[PDB]
PDB file of C-alpha atoms and ligand atoms in Angstrom:
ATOM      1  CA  UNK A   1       0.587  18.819  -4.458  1.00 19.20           C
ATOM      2  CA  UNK A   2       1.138  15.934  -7.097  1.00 19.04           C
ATOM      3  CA  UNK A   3       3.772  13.002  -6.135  1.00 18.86           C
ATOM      4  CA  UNK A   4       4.813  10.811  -8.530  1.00 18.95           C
ATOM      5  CA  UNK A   5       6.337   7.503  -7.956  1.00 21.18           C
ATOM      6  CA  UNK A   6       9.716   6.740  -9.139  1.00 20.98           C
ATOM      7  CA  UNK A   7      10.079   7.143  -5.485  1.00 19.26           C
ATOM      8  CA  UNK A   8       8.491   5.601  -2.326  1.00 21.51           C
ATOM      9  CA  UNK A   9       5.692   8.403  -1.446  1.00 20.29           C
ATOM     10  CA  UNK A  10       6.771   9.336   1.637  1.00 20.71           C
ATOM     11  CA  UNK A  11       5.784  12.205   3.441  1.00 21.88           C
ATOM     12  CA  UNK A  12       6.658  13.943   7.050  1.00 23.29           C
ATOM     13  CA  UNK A  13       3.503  13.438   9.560  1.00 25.81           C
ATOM     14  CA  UNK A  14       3.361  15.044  12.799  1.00 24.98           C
ATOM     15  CA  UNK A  15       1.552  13.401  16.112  1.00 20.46           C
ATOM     16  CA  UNK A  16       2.389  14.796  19.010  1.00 22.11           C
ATOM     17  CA  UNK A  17       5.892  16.015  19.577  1.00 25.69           C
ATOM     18  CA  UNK A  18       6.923  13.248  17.091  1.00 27.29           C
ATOM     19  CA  UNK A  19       7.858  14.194  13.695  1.00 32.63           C
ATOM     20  CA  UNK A  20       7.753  11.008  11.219  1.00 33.35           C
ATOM     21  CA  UNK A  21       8.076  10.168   8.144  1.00 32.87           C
ATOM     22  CA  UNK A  22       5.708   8.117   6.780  1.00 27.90           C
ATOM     23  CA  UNK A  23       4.222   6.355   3.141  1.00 26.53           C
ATOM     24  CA  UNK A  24       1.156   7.788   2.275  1.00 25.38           C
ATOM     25  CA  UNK A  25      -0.231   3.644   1.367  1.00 25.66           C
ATOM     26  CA  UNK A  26      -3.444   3.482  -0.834  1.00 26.78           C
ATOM     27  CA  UNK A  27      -3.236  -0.314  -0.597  1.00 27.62           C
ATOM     28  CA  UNK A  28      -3.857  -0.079   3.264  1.00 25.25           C
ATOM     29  CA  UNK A  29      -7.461   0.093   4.552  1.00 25.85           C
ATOM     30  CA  UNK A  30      -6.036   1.419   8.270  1.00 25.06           C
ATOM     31  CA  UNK A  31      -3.161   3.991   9.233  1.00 24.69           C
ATOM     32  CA  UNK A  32      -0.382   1.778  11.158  1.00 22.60           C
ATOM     33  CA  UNK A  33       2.719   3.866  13.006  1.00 21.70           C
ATOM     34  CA  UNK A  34       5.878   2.496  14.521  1.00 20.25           C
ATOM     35  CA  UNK A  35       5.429   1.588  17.812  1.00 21.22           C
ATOM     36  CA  UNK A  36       4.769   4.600  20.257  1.00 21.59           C
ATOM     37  CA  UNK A  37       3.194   5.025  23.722  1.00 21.53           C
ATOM     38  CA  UNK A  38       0.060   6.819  22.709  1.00 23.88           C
ATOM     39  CA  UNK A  39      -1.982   8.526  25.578  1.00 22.08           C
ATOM     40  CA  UNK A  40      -5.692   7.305  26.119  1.00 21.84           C
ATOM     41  CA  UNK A  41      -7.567   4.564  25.647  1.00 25.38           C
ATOM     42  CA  UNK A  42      -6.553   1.421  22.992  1.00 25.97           C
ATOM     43  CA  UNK A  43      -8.185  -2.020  21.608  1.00 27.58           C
ATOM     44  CA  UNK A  44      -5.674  -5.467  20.940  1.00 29.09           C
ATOM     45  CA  UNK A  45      -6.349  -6.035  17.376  1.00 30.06           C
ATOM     46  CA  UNK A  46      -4.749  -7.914  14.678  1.00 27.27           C
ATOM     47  CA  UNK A  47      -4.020  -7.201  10.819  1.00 24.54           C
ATOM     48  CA  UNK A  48      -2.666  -8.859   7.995  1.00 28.64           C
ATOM     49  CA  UNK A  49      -0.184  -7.991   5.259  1.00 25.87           C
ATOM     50  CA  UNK A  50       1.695  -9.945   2.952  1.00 26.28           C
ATOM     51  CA  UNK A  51       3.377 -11.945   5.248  1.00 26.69           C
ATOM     52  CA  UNK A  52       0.813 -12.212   7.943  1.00 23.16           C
ATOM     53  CA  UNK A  53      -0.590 -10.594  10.750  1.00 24.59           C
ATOM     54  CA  UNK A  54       0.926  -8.480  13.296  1.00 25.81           C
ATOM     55  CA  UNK A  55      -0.440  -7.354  16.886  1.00 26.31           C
ATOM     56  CA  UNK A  56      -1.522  -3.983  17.162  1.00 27.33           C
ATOM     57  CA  UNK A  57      -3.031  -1.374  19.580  1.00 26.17           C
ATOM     58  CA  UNK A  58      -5.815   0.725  18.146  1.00 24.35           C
ATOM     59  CA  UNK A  59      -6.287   4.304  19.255  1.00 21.67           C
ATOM     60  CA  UNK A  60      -9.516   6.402  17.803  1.00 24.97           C
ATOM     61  CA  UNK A  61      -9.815   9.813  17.056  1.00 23.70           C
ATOM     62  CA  UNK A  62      -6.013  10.927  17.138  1.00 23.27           C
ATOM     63  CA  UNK A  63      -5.451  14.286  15.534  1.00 26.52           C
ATOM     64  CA  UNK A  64      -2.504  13.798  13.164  1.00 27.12           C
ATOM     65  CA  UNK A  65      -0.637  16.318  10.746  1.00 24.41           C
ATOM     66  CA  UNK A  66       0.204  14.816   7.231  1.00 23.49           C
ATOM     67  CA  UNK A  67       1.992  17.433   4.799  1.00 23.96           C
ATOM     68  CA  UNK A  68       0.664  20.568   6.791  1.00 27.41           C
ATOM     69  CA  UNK A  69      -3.227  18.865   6.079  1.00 28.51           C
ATOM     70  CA  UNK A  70      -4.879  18.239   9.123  1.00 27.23           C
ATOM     71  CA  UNK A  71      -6.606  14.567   9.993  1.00 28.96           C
ATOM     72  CA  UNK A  72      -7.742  12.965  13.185  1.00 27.76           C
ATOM     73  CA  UNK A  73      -8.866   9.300  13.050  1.00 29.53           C
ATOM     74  CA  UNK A  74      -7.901   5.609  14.564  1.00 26.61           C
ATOM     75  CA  UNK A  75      -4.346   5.088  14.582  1.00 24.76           C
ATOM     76  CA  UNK A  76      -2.579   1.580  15.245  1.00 25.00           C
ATOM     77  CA  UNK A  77       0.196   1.134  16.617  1.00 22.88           C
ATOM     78  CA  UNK A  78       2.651  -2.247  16.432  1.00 22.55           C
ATOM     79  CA  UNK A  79       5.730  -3.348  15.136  1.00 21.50           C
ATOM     80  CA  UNK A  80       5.604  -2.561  11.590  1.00 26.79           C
ATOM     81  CA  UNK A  81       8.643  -1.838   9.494  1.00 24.69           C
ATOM     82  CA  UNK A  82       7.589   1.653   7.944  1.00 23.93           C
ATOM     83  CA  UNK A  83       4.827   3.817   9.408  1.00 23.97           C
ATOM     84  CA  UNK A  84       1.984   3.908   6.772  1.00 24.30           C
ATOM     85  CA  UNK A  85      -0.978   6.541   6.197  1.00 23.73           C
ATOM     86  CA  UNK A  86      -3.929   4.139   5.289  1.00 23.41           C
ATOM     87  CA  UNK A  87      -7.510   5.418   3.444  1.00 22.37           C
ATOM     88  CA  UNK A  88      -8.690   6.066   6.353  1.00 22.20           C
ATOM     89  CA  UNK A  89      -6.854   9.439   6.418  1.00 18.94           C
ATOM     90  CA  UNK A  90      -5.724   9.645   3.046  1.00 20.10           C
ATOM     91  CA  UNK A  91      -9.522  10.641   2.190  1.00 18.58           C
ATOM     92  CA  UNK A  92      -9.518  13.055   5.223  1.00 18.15           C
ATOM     93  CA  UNK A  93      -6.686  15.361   3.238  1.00 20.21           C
ATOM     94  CA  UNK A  94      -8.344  14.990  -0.058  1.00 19.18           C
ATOM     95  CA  UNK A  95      -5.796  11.909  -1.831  1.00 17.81           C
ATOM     96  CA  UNK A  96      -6.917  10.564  -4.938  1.00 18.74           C
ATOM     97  CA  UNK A  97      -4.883   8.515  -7.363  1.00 17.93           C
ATOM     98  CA  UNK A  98      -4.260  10.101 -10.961  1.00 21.97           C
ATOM     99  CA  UNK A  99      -3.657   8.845 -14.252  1.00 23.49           C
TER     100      UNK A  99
ATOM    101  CA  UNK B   1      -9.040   8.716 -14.634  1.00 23.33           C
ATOM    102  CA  UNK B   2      -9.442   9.881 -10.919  1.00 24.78           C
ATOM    103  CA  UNK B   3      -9.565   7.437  -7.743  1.00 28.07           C
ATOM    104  CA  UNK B   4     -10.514   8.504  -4.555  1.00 26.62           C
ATOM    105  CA  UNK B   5      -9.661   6.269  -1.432  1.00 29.76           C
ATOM    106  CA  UNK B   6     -13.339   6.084   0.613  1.00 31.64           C
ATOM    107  CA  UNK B   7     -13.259   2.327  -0.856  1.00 30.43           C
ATOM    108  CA  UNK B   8     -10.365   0.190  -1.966  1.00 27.70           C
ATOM    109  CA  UNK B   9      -8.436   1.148  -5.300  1.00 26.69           C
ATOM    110  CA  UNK B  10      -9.490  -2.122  -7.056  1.00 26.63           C
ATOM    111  CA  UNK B  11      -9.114  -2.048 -11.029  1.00 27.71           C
ATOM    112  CA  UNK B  12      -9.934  -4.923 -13.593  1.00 28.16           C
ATOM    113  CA  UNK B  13      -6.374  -5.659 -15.096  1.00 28.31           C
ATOM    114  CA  UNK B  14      -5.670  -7.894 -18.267  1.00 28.46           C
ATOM    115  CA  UNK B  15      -3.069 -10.655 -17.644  1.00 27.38           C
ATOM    116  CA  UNK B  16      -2.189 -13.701 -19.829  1.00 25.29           C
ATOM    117  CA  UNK B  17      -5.727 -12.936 -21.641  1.00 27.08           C
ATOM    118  CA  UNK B  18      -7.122 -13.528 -17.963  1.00 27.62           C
ATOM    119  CA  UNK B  19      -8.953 -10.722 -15.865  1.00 29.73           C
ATOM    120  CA  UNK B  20      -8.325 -10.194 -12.023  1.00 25.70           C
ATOM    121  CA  UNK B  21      -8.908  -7.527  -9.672  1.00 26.70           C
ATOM    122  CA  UNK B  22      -5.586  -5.604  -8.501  1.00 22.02           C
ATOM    123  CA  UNK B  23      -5.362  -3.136  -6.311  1.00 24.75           C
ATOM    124  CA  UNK B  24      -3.315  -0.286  -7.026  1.00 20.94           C
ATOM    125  CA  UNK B  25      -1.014   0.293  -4.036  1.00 20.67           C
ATOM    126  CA  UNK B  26       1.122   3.257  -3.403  1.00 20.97           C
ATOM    127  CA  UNK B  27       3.143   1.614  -0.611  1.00 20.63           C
ATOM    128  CA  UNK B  28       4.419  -1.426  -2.680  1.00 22.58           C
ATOM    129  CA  UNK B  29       7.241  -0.939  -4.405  1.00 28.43           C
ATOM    130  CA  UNK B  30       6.433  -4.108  -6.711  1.00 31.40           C
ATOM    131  CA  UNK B  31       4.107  -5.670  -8.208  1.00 34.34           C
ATOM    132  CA  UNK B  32       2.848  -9.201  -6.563  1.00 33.10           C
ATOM    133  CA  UNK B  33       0.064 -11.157  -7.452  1.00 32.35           C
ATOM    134  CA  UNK B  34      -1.555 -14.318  -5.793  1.00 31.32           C
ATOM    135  CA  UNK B  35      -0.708 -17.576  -7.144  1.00 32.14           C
ATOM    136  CA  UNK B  36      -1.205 -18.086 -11.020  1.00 33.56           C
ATOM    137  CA  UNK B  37       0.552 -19.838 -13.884  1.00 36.07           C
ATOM    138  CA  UNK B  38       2.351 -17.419 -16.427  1.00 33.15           C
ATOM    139  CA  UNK B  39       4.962 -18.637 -18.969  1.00 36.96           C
ATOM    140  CA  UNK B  40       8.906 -18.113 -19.263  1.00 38.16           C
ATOM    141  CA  UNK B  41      11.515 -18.243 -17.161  1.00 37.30           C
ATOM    142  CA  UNK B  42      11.255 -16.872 -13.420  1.00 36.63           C
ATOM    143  CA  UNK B  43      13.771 -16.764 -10.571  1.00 40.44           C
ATOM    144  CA  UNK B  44      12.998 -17.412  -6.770  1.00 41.46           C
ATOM    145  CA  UNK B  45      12.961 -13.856  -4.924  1.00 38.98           C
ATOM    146  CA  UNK B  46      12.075 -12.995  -1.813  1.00 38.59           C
ATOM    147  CA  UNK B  47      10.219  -9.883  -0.147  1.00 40.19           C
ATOM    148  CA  UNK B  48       8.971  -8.280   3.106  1.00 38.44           C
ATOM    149  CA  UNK B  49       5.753  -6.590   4.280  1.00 35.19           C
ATOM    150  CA  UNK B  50       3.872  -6.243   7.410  1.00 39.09           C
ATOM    151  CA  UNK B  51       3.599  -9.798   9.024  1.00 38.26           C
ATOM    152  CA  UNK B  52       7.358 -10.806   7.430  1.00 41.82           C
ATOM    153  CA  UNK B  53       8.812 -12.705   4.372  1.00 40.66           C
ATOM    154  CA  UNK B  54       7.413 -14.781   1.708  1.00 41.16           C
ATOM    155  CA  UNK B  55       8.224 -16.401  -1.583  1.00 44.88           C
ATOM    156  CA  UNK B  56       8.003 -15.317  -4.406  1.00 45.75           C
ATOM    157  CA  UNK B  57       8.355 -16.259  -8.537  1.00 43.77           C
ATOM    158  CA  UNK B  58       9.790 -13.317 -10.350  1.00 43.82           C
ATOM    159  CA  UNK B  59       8.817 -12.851 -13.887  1.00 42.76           C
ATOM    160  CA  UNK B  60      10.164 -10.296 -16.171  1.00 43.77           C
ATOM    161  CA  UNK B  61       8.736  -7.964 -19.004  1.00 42.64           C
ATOM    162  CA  UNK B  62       5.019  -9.502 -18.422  1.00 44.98           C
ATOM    163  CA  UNK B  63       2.616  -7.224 -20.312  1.00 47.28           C
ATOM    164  CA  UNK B  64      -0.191  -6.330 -18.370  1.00 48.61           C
ATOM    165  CA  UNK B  65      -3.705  -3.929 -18.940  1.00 47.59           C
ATOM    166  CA  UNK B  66      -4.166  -2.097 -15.751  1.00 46.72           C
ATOM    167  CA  UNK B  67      -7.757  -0.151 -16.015  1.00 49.85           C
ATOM    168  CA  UNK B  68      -7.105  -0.036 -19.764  1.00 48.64           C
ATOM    169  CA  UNK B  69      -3.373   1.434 -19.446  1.00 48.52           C
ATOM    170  CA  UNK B  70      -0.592  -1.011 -20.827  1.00 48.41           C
ATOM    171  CA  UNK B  71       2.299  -1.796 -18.771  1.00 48.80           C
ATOM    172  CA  UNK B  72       5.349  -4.057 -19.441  1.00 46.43           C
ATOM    173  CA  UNK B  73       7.446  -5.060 -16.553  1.00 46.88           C
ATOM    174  CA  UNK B  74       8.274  -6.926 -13.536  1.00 49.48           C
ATOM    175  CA  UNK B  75       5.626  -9.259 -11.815  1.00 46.86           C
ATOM    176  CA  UNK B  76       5.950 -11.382  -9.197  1.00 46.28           C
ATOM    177  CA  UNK B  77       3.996 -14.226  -7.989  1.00 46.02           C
ATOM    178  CA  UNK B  78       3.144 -15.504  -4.749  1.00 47.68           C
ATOM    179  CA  UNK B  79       1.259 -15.787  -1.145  1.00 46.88           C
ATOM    180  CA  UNK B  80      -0.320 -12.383  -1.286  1.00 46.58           C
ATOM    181  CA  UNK B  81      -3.183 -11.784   0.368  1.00 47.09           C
ATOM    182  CA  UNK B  82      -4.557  -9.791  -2.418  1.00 45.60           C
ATOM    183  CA  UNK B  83      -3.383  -8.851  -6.284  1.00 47.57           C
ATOM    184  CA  UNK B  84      -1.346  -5.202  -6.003  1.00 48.67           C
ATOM    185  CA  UNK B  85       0.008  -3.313  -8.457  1.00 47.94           C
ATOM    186  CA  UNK B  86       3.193  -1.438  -6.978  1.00 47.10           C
ATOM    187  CA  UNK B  87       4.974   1.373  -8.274  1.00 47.35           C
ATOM    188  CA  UNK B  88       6.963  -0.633 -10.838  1.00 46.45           C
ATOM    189  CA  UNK B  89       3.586  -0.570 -13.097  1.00 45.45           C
ATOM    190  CA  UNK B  90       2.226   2.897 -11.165  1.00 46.81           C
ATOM    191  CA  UNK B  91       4.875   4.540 -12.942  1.00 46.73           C
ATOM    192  CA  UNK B  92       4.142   3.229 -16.210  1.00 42.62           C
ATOM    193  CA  UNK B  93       0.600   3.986 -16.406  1.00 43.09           C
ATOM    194  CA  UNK B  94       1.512   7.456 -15.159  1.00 41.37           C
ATOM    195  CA  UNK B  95      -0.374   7.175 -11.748  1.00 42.79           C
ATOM    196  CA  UNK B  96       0.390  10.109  -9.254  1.00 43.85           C
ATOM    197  CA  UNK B  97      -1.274  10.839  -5.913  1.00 43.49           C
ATOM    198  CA  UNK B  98      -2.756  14.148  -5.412  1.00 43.61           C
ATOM    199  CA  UNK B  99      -4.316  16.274  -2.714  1.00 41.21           C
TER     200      UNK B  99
HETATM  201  C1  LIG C 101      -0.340  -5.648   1.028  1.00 42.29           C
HETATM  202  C2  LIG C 101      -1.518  -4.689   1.185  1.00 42.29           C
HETATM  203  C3  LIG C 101      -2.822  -5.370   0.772  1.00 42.29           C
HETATM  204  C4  LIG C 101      -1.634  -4.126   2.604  1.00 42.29           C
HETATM  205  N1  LIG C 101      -0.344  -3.563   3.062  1.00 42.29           N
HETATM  206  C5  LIG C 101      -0.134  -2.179   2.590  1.00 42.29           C
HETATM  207  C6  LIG C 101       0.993  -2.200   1.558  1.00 42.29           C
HETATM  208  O1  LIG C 101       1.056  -0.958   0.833  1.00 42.29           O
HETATM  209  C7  LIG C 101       2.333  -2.524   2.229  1.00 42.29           C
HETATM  210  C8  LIG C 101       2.949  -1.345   2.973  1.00 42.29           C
HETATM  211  C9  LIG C 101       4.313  -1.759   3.480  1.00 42.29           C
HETATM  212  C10 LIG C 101       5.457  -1.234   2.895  1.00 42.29           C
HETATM  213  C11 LIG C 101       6.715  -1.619   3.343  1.00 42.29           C
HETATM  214  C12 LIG C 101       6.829  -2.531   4.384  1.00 42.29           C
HETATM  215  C13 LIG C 101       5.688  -3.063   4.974  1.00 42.29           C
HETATM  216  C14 LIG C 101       4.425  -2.680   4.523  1.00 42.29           C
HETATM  217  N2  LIG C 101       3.268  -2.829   1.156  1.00 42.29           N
HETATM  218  C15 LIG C 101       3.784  -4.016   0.866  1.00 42.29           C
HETATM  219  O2  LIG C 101       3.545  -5.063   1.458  1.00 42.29           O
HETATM  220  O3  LIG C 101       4.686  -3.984  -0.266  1.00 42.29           O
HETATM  221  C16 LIG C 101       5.498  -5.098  -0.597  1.00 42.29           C
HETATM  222  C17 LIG C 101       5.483  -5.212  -2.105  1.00 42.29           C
HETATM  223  O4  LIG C 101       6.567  -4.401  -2.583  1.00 42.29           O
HETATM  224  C18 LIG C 101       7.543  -4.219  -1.548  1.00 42.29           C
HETATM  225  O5  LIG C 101       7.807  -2.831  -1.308  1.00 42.29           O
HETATM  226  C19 LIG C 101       7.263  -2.439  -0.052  1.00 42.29           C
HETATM  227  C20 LIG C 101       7.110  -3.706   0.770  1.00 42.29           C
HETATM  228  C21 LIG C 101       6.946  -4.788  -0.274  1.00 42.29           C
HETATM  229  S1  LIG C 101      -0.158  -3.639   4.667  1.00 42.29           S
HETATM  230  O6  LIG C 101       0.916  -2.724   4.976  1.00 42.29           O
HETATM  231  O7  LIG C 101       0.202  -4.991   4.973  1.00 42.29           O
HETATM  232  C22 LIG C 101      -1.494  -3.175   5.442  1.00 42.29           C
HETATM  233  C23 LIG C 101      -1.601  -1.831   5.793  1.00 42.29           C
HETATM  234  C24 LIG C 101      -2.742  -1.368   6.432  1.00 42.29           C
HETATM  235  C25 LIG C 101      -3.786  -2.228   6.739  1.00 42.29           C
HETATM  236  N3  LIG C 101      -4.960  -1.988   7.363  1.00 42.29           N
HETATM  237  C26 LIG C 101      -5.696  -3.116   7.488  1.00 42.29           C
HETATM  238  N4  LIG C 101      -7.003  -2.964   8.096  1.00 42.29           N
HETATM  239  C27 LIG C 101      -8.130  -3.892   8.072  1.00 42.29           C
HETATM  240  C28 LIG C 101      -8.334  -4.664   9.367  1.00 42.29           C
HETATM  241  C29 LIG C 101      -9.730  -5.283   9.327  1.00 42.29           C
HETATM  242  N5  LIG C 101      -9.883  -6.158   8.150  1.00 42.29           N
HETATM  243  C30 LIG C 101     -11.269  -6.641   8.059  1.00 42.29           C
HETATM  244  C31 LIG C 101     -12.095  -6.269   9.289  1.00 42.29           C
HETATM  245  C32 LIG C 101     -12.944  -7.479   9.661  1.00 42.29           C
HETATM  246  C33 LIG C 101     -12.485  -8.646   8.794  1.00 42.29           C
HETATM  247  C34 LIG C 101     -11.304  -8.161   7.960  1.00 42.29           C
HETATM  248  C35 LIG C 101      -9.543  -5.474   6.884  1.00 42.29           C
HETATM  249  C36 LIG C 101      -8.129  -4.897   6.942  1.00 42.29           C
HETATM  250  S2  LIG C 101      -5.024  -4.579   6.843  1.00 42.29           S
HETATM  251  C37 LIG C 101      -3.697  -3.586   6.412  1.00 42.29           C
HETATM  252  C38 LIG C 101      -2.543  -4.050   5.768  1.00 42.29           C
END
């Protein structure tokens, strides 16, 4: 599909038996969800955004389902304010920005 | 013309007869660019991303050349970590994601 951008992008992902929405970010290097208590192994890791850095857990090679497309790739996990599909998995469904 | 995400989307834009690199980011809803001088009159605003609140100067109907596309609009100034271009300008230019 094509979205435009009047609106925020937002999109429904799927990981697990959680349904989310989430923006699909092309300003964000990494994929970070709303906090949720992953199976498997994680990493403590830190990242920054406009008003500095928040604590995060990193989990690799999660499958997740974004628009029906499927992607599997490191996840973090912390206490941001909207769950945001970074490059990292953008690029796995084939994203590119248009104009 | 057509972006794809494997690096970040940074773009040469025209501001004030001054070039920066911006990148062009989906999951802002404005524009915000690190600290610079630009004329006219500007209010104090303040927005939220990942890590919290900061400060901003808002300046109004300041032309800028994003990747050789002209936009007119709002830009705000402040303690960004990098220069983005939100969907304010997105729009203008006619930028759409697609997959
Ligand atoms: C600001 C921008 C550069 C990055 N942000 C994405 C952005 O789209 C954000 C998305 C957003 C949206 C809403 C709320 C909150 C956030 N929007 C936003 O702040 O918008 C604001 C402007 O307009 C307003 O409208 C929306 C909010 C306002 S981010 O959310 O903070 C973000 C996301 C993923 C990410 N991955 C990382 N990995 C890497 C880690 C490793 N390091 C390197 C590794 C070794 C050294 C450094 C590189 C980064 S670092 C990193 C930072």
């Amino acid at each position: 599909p094509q979205i435009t951008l009047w609106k925020r992008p937002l999109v429904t992902i799927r990981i697990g038996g959680q349904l989310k929405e989430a923006l699909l970010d092309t300003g964000a290097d990494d994929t970070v969800l709303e906090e949720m208590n992953l199976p498997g192994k994680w990493k403590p890791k830190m990242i920054g955004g406009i008003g500095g850095f928040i604590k995060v857990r990193q989990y690799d090679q999660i499958p997740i389902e974004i628009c029906g497309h499927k992607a599997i790739g490191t996840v973090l996990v912390g206490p941001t304010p909207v769950n945001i599909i970074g490059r990292n998995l953008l690029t796995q469904i084939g994203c590119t920005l248009n104009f």
